[PDB]
Write a protein that binds this ligand. Structure first.
Ligand SMILES: CCCCCCCCCCCCCCCCC[C@@H](O)O[C@H](CO[C@H](O)CCCCCCCCCCCCCCC)COP(=O)(O)OCC[N+](C)(C)C
Ligand SMILES: CCCCCCCCCCCCCCCCCC(=O)OC[C@H](COP(=O)(O)OCCN)OC(=O)CCCCCCCCCCCCCCCCC
Lengths: 174, 121
């Protein structure tokens, strides 16, 4: 279905085996599926056809808001309130987008676990490593900022991480 | 006494001549409206204390209360605005005259400023 993007939300091709009956006994599941298709699926499909016909007469569109990039807190001068405000808002929006990216990866992981079923420990290794990487990066970025998090606090955290990495690299190269 | 004895101060002058160059308060100033409200409250309290009908009696008296309060509030607001303008004028002049005491500092960005990070956990 064109409702969502198959690249963002992948699913493996569905291999459904053909029925291979070996008995003369009728299949109650098949009979009940036929009854369900006659009594339920046809009325609901007719109702949806009517509603979709009514919708197509009143077609109208809504758009996705586009935000342009603005200078960030690294470029903002000290106690320059306007640039600080714009940078803080931009950082907040990026934080929201990162949260939703983590949500998408988690949805992939859950769906793969359920889909694979009894062999999920081996068949969902690709999704587990991707979730591990995404979650580790997200944690390193926004792990312990507190209730009053801000772009300045995240910048201080990143500067601390960069100092620690530089020190470790110097010690290794020593 | 900060501004008492400021040079060129005429004693016992509620509003000097140099205050005429400032924008006078608008007659619909919220502070003037609050002064009128104080006058109205005084009128109601007068009726209540004298045991007249509070809202009805003494309409002329209530009008006089409100008018007096608005009048004095207008002049008080003019004097208050003049004093604040004078304070800002003096402060700006002193900062201009003492550059070595009020120096302009080079602005450093947050990419250059280093701040200690305190994790919350
Ligand atoms: C009919 C219309 C209504 C009239 C009602 C009249 C009621 C008030 C009477 C008027 C009182 C002020 C007299 C105005 C003429 C006198 C001019 C002179 O007195 O004004 C200046 C001085 O006037 C008074 O000092 C200030 C008048 C304002 C006082 C009323 C407001 C007080 C603030 C309260 C804030 C919260 C309440 C807001 C009001 C409801 C002179 O400065 P200066 O001679 O060199 O002072 C030397 C001493 N110092 C330097 C230490 C101060
Ligand atoms: C009767 C009981 C006592 C109440 C009497 C009230 C009298 C008010 C009217 C005064 C005379 C009118 C007048 O001179 O109006 C001129 C001016 C209009 O304002 P102006 O700047 O010209 O407007 C341009 C932008 N609109 O007017 C003004 O700027 C006047 C505004 C200043 C504040 C006036 C008082 C505010 C109200 C206090 C409460 C009094 C009313 C209570 C009513 C209760 C009724 C039950």
């Amino acid at each position: 279905p064109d409702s969502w993007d198959k690249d963002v939300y992948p699913e493996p091709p569905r291999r459904t085996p053909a029925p291979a009956p070996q008995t003369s006994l009728p299949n109650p599941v098949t009979y009940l599926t036929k009854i369900f298709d006659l009594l339920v699926d046809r009325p609901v499909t007719l109702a949806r056809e009517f509603i979709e016909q009514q919708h197509a007469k009143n077609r109208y569109y809504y758009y996705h808001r586009e935000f342009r990039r603005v200078p960030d807190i690294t470029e903002c001068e000290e106690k320059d309130i306007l640039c600080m405000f714009e940078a803080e808002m931009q950082w907040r929006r990026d934080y929201k987008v990162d949260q939703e990216i983590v949500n998408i990866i988690q949805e992939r992981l859950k769906a793969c676990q359920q889909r694979e079923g009894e062999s999920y420990r081996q068949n969902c290794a690709k999704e587990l490593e991707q979730f591990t990487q995404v979650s580790k990066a997200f944690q390193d970025r926004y792990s312990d900022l507190g209730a009053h998090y801000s772009a300045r606090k995240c910048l201080a955290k990143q500067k601390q991480r960069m100092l620690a990495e530089r020190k470790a690299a110097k010690e290794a190269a020593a | 006494t900060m501004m008492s004895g400021r040079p060129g101060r005429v004693p016992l002058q509620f509003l000097p001549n140099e205050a005429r160059s400032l924008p006078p308060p608008k007659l619909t100033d919220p502070r003037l409206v609050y002064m009128g409200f104080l006058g109205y409250c005084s009128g109601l309290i007068d009726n209540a204390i004298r045991r007249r009908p509070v809202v009805s009696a003494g309409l002329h008296r209530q009008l006089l209360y409100v008018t007096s309060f608005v009048f004095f509030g207008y002049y008080l607001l003019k004097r208050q605005d003049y004093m604040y303008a004078l304070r800002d004028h003096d402060m700006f002049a002193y900062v201009k005259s003492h550059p070595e005491d009020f120096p302009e500092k080079d602005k450093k960005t947050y990419g250059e400023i280093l701040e200690e990070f305190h994790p919350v956990r």
